Symmetry: D2
Subunit: 213 residues, 4 copies
Amino acid sequence: RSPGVVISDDEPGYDLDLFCIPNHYAEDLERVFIPHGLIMDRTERLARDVMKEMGGHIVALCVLKGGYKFFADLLDYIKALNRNSDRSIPMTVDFIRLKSYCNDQSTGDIKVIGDDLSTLTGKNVLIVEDIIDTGKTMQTLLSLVRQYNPKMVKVASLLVKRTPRSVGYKPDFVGFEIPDKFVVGYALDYNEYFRDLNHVCVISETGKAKYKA
Amino acid sequence: SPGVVISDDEPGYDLDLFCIPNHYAEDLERVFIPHGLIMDRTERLARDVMKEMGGHHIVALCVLKGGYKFFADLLDYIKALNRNSDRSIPMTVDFIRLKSYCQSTGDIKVIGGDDLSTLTGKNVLIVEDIIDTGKTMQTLLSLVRQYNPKMVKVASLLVKRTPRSVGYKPDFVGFEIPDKFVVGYALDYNEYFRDLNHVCVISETGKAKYKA
Amino acid sequence: RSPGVVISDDEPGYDLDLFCIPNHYAEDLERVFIPHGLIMDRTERLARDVMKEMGGHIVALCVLKGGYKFFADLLDYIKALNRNSDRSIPMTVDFIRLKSYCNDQSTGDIKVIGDDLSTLTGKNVLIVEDIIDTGKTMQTLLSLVRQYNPKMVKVASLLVKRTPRSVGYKPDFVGFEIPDKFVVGYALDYNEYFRDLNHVCVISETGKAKYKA
Amino acid sequence: SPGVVISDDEPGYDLDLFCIPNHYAEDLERVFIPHGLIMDRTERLARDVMKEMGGHHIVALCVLKGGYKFFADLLDYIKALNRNSDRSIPMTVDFIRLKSYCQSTGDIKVIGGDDLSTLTGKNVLIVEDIIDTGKTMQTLLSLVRQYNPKMVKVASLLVKRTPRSVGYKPDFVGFEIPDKFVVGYALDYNEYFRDLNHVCVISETGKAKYKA
Ligand SMILES: O=c1[nH]cnc2c1ncn2CCOCCP(=O)(O)O
Ligand SMILES: O=c1[nH]cnc2c1ncn2CCOCCP(=O)(O)O
Ligand SMILES: O=c1[nH]cnc2c1ncn2CCOCCP(=O)(O)O
Ligand SMILES: O=c1[nH]cnc2c1ncn2CCOCCP(=O)(O)O
């Protein structure tokens, strides 16, 4: 559908010493995958795409705690397009909280939702996500919005991992399709760390162990 | 310190001196605070924040009404400062969502309040975009303090100079401004001015055009 | 004509502890006059104005060694407007070198110019300046360009000091009209220092003495 | 280290993946380096520069052909790093202006060459946007070194991977790129693409449309 910028399994990303990384993360990473400014540029084209489709009207839906960073930037770029409209265009920002927990037994997925979503009826709703792996967060967000009978529904995600997709709702706007590696930085922390890391990088084993839980 | 004081005297800035979207040509009076000025002040606030709360964990709690632009920017500057620390400092970011009612701002209605007990024994920075009568905050302080945090500080982009004020003063003030109704940057008006970068006084023809 | 943003003699600028200033300049300044981002926003409106007038065509003329900073930013904003034109618009950047020396005796002003200005004939030329005080740099740049018979001539200056103007060519685009104080930062260094200072501030006596010559 | 190597293999990026001005829809083949990637790399180069030349004075010498965007950006990052130093480090910024002639790039024609003897006994960083055959630089190095600087390093945004290359290698490389003719960011084409943020390979219909 437009797989986004494809970062392939074959020799992925960039060597660490090529970009600016906080010294206190010198050992906590393997490679860098997507430098910040690269995220920005892509996110910019992405906002252009969104307006192509959406815009009757638009309710941008942010997924809380985690997804604020990418939402912020994506919306900054959109606000940027809107400044030139001949009529001022109302956009409404909306929020769901959503947390996940390790399943442990069974397989069974654990999702804890959101609250107050009256502002959804008959509107054009964009779901904004940080990353897609198993597809459950997306699937969860999907049926949740269909529940409030909107007009239109699209999913934007900065990241889509190249993994065993169960079958679902293929995202409409994809920032980057990346290898099956565990990534931190930009929008993805690891137990409260890496927030000051602007780039999407692969966490190392030293990092995982050091940044406990 | 009451932050950058913008006087009752000569208000702010003439509209044509800065870049504003054509669709708002009519909906404003003055520019109080251009976007970049907000950024520069915010960069400083972030620095003040680390001086008093740095090293320790800190839970950044955003008072989420209609947007979190300010929160977003404050945290980028804070993250920018934390890039230098010898040790990586973990930062917990959370939101407390308020819905609006009633004239009677002191009555808060929290919606997004997951484990409020995560706050217990932690260092909380509460981030707010504008303080007016001061009622919302002071009754929000009451709620928060019951979960006995180790310490609570408050940071507001804008503190309005009003008689209607009950005297609550934030620990970090971006700008002390005149008692006029402002929009822009982080303050929307019935879903409008979201794309306006600057803090500007809303005109009467804008007040009518966009009113709920 | 449009005096620009007026910073008046009466209680000018902001207290130092209100903005972010390099620690190594803690004592070398009195007040801050124009924070960086404020310069940016104004510069932005300024680029809009320029396009109003100019644009047949445009030759933006940069004054070398000193004026590169403001030129860079002003042109970045203009490039930004140009991206939306339906036809790609050629802009030509041009350069003069220009140095001044303390007069000492007489009064007599010393100006050392520039070289190769063939690309001036019949074009629309913008003179870009950092600051206007006595008006001589502007006057010098003026008669120099009139010498190559252009079509149109305008002066943009970020700063205009409120001082004894001798009489000349009043600038077309003014960023800020500021008090008669000695200012450093942003585009104005002091013997190689203050380049890392983004804001326009008033140099103190400690600063003057410390930053020798 | 040869900088960020962009392979002959899979070139760069599909045009529709990034934001490019509508008037160039037709005048390009691929995006090699999006603007923000340039910025991020440049931020690192600035850091590498300070590691080897920091503390000392350093004269930043920009090789000025048609523009100095890159120079401008490199110096902002350098100034950004210098904001932290205990002592203020004075930085001398100068330009050396070259005009173009003749196929024979090694023959330089300096125009803007005020006191070239200011370089004597100083630490010079020479900043260039693209290196191709390497002739311009190596004969520019000859000129500069005669004023006996204490030390000369060279920094180039782009080093082109060409057989036509005489083997000169800069001390700091932004990106090693394929042997294709690129425009954008800092490289204009007969006054065009100045407003193009990214490094992109120029198409043949763009080569014709804008040719001198
Ligand atoms: O690579 C990852 N870094 C950080 N968190 C990750 C990563 N991969 C998966 N996660 C968990 C959070 O996102 C899960 C997306 P879902 O599996 O589609 O619901
Ligand atoms: O000037 C205003 N612009 C936008 N919203 C405003 C303004 N003044 C008051 N409000 C509503 C939200 O501020 C109320 C917080 P409180 O009055 O301190 O409880
Ligand atoms: O306030 C100043 N800071 C730094 N340099 C300054 C200042 N005022 C004057 N100068 C000298 C450089 O500009 C001179 C402009 P002119 O006197 O109009 O030719
Ligand atoms: O790919 C190019 N884009 C724009 N200008 C280019 C390109 N390749 C060569 N030039 C001309 C300037 O570069 C020549 C420097 P030299 O060939 O190392 O002496």
